[model samples]
Target chain A: PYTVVYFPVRGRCAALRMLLADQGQSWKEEVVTVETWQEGSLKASCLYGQLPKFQDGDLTLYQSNTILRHLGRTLGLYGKDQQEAALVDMVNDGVEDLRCKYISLIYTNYEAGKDDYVKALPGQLKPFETLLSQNQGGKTFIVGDQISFADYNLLDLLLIHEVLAPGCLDAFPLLSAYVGRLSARPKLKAFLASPEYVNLPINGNGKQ
Target chain B: PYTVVYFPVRGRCAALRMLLADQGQSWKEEVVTVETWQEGSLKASCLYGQLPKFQDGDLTLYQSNTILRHLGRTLGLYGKDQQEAALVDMVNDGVEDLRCKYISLIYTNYEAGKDDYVKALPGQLKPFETLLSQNQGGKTFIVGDQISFADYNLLDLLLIHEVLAPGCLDAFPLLSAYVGRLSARPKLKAFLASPEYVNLPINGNGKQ
Candidate 1:
């Protein structure tokens, strides 16, 4: 059995949630309410003073990407070999860099930062676009033919960006098509359409 | 052969450089001059439009931590087991979080932000201290008895923070001692004393 502890918002857990759903794995959520979180003990008890805690059997884990990678390792989604694993890490790190910027803008100063962020969006989005182009002409996954952990992260990133800036992917045909293709996977599509995902805001402050 | 391409600063490459040096692995540095970077072609040609690009034979990788993890994987510095590897990543990710903030302050608003940054220093350093406390009375490395790649990154993080805020680790006995212990390792100690490491400023800007 696996357990995930996070705030009620979809925030960091969404990608992992999508991964679990798509992989047909069952896990439980220990949702941390804001009031309970304000009590300070849980946050204080956290290894890095943040949520999205995880448990697989007796081993407890923190850090969202760490959880993703652990699952990837266990499930054999990391890659076919060491070199492919390096490429997997490369794509995931790029996704994380962009996600950090997106989170800052959404939570801190969306109105003031959104204009510049959206204007510069193409540059940030291009690397992933090029990644897709290089790998089977965007017909398959990010690293190789089979999907890896990075695809889930990249899919979530593209989904949120489209929500933040409508038509943001219009100019990048590869990215736009990539988002459509990944989202349409039956299990993931069902997960995305379900109320559990729909009810929660993308972030804590009710933006996006 | 491994080759690192970046500006002359120690910024993102410091930890990986330290890792390779201490492991007795030789790598070549392809320093990208300001004029060369300004030429725009190299930066444009880079997949992610960033520095700290790395090449190992025919394979090229970007993202500093990706490079770190790849080296960790290839060099047997990850951990003793799967569980330990996850713990190592947790430590590395925490280091990355702090390093991002450190870079932002150094590059964006050091003069204006220095005071507040120093004021909040204790809270930021406590988690690492607690991590050390939980593991072998602060005697062993971050995750296990054997040193992992996270230790190198953590060592650099502590070193630069000390430069940023003198006496910052005075409150955290374990972190202070961890720094001393890691710094005194023979290969690492000599590397620290070398002109190659000493001559470069911590950041591209004039700040620490």
Candidate 2:
């Protein structure tokens, strides 16, 4: 019964919302307005002076993957051993890379940095696509046979890109389909439809 | 018996190396040439397509802190529970933010995007300085009493800024002093002087 505060948009907290939805966990939402996000401590101290923060009881956490790991462990989704857990982390890190690049496209006005951004996509996304393919290991999920936090994380980023920028999926074809299929799950599918989750930019139009 | 590849500079691998150094563990450093890093698959296959990678047996990992976490768990530094570990992660994330800002200052030619870089640091660093100073339960480290991976991570970034850009610390007196004291650790002090660690560049002549 903790509070998760972030920009109303599905920026970083979208990952958290996906984790909660995928796990069927209920939490409070403390959305910040554009002005508040700019003026408030929402992005700073609450989240190590960064955005997309989660606060559970006396503990406040930053770093989307770290928060995901906390939620993942509580929900029994990370893994059994240190190595498996690290793999969970490994795959999550992959999703994060995509997220960072996706953010650049949305926020950095990639039109200005188009050359830098596009040039990085194939090189950056290729390895992740390969890693995800390899990590899948003939299994449906990225970590273990059962669905893990990695699944939700990877899928969320895939969906975010698809919704914000149409053709991003063209570069990551397999991952694109993987998320498309995974989005059909009951909990996950519902979460994707939920109002709690902010709608992504349409044709790269939305922004704060 | 893992092959750890990174730039000879301690920018990324230093944390894991320091983790290994603190435990007196054995690890092979595959010196990465600047050209190799610039035009090699090694850096690309990384989690975020960034440097500082660790490979152990069948597993290869990326992301600086994730690599640290891998070694930390192996070295018995990552705490026992999810909560304890998350706190360490929060602190590590903070250290990373600081490092990114420091990096933008030193490595990134801010002249191209001066506004973006300048806008990020104050809001980021001041709060950290406040958080570090506000704590009445001063245990002398970023997190818990014992030195966890958080400490090493903090030390590495501070060490990066301290040597690379001494002026970076000029504004944040407490953090600079903190790094100064940490760099003075007999063990860490010795490693800082070791040939493997590279002094980061700041201004024109920061570290020799």
Candidate 3:
């Protein structure tokens, strides 16, 4: 009942896909062609012809974050109530900010332009680690005391950084441990070992 | 029971502020100091150490979009039901995409080494016009045939473009009418005219 589509690159859409895998939900990943990517047709698949669209049966949803929310809702990992869902989205979008930075650092080698990638990363990670810690509330998970969308997202984010800057997590033990714990989950463990989920060289990061 | 703090400019915080105004709800708008914006200390007043934080007594909330939902819940405009709120968020975030474009064209324009002013404005407006049209359902406002956060956000976005790009709303007649319509509301009317609500301009493209 689901077909998640995006470019072959492990960009924004992978977060949602990773979330589904964490939940043991199977979904087909349809990576768009490079021609479409370069022609910019990949961004124009909305009702108004926007790209990065997700086809869940008859409903074609666009906007990467919106697609994630839809997928999250379907798998029951988004949130349980209105406020909860909003917070879930807040974390999701907040992480998207990091993803943009992730691409800049990895691809552009932290030389993308004006912003300092290394310096700004601390600010980003601090908020995330702090939130993850607070939301843990004595539990290992970031939210709901169990695997949720945020956990999957945090994993994807860590994996990006892990590939970009392997030693980056040394400073944040909580996050490093959290990543290790989540990735060890049976579904994620099996998926990570599969060729379909091999997202190595995740960014332009030279180390990756 | 809400205390909201943000800078004088409505760049990121307008969505939540408009929601509160639409509901006839009175809340404090704390203008942060230069140090506050620099250190992002304002958000620490809540959780995430980000700006435009809201507090309903002890339950302080950061993340402007999340605050919008909380205000929506308090204002009775979000939805009496769950699906209604989700739709409200969907539309609000959709408008936010246009807002992101505005930010990019303004601040990030020089970084890209090109003035995308003319090209970017229309590209952002077209989809919003479509969204507002559907939200209107050919009636007065967005959502449930009455005023909602989506309406306020749509109005703010249109006005932001107007101030940011004077003739920008011309192509999107529906959005123009929507902004003009919301501008007439007594509370919103007074706020926009107030000196405290000054608009920020980038350079000669209208923000001079």
Candidate 4:
């Protein structure tokens, strides 16, 4: 069993949660409220003083990507081979880079930056489109025919970005179809419709 | 065989370069000149518009951490087992977090932010110190008895920070000693002292 300790916001854990739900894994969430976080004791005990701490059996891990990777390794979602594994990491890092920019805009300068960010969204997303175009005509998964951790993270990135900027993905047909396909997975579809996911905002600040 | 396409500066490629050197892996460097970058052709061609693009035989990859993880996977520098691999990722992600802050300070706000960043340096570095404290008295390595890629990245992070703020590691004995021990490795020691590593400014903007 896995336990995720994070704030109630679906921020970083959304991808991992999606992955877990898709894989039919049983996991628990230890929600950290703002009051508890402001109390500061949990922050002090956290290794990096950040939430989304993961406990996989006896091993406790921090860093959202690290947790994703830990689950990926155990669940055979890494990749089929060494090269595919590298591609998975590459896709993940790219997703993270854009996600970081999205987060900064959302939390820090959403009003001032939203227009420019949305204007530049196509270019920001073109690489993934290009990635899809090059890989089996975007029919298969990101790295291979099988799903990998990058798929989940990238899916979340796309979902959140769409919420941040509706119609942002229309120009990228491959990504649009990819999002549709991933979301239609029975487990993920159910999870998406569930109140557990729908009730929470994409970010803590209520910007998205 | 490997080919690294990057700017002349040792900014993102430092750890990977160090890793290649220590592993006795022969690799070629395709240095991107400032004039060429200003021309924008190379940047346009780059998938993510970033440097440190790596070519391993037929496989081309980007994202510096992705490159590091790829090499770690291929060269057996990852870890002994699944659990150890996650720990390695945790350490590397922590190092990357601090390195991002360091880069921002160097490129954007060195003069204004240097003092403040250095002022809170101890708190920033405490996690790594704590990590070392838990693992074999800080004498063996970051994750396990055998060296992993995070060790190289952490060593470079420590070295650059020391240059940024001398005596910053004085508060953390394990990190200080860990730096000394890692720096003493023959291949890495030679590489760090060589003209290739020494001649370039730490950042492209010459602040560091």
Native RMSD of candidate 3 (Å): 3.9
Question: A1-208, model 1: which lDDT tens digit per residue?
Answer: 8999999888889999999999999999899998999998999889888988999998788899998888888877888988989999999999999999999998899989999999999999999989989999999999988889999989999999999999989999998889899899999999999998999899988887
Candidate 2 CAPRI grade: medium
Per-residue lDDT tens digits for candidate 4, residues A1-208, read: 7999999989999999999999999999899999999999999988889988999989999999999998999999999999999999999999999998998998999999999999988989999999999999998888888999999999999999998889999999999999999999999999999998999889999898
Residue by residue across B1-208, what tens digits does model 4's lDDT show? 8999999998999999999999999999999898989998888777788888999999999999999999999999999999999999999999998998999899889988998999888899999999999999999899989999999999999999999899999999999999999999999999999999999788889876
lDDT of 4 at A65: 96
Q: Which regions of candidate 2 are displaced past 4 Å? A: A38-47, A113-122, A136-138, A167-173, A198-208, B35-50, B110-123, B134-136, B164-177, B198-208
Q: By DockQ, is 2 or 3 better?
A: 2
- Report clash pairs, candidate 1: none
- Candidate 1 per-residue lDDT, tens place, B69-176, comes to 999999999889988888898899889999999999998999999999989878988999998999998998999888899999999999999999999999999999
Give a tens-digit lDDT track for model 2, residues A1-208: 7678766666667767777876778889876777886786655446465566778888777777778877887788877777877887777766775676676676678567655765665665565577657755433676666677877777776665554446776867676677777788788788878665545432234642
The number of the candidate with the highest lDDT is 4
True contacts kept of each: 0.61, 0.59, 0.16, 0.86
Maximum-TM-score candidate: 4
The collision pairs in model 2 are A44-A49, B164-B200
What is the TM-score of candidate 4? Answer: 0.99
**B1-208, model 3: which lDDT tens digit per residue?**
7787766566677666766765677788787766767775455544556566777777656677667766665567775454444455566767776666666666756445334665566876777677667764434665556576777777777776676567888887887777787888888887767664555332224431
Q: What does candidate 3's lDDT look like per residue over A1-208, in tens digits? A: 7787766656666667777776777678776676766685556545445445677677566666666656665567766665666566567667766776676555665555424666556667776677777875424776555456766777788887766566777888778788888888888788777777685335323334
User: Candidate 3, fnat value?
Assistant: 0.16
- Model 4, which residues run further than 4 Å from truth? none
- Residue B47, candidate 4: Cα error in Å is 1.4
Candidate 4, chain B, TM-score (2 decimals): 0.98
Ranking by TM-score: 4, 1, 2, 3
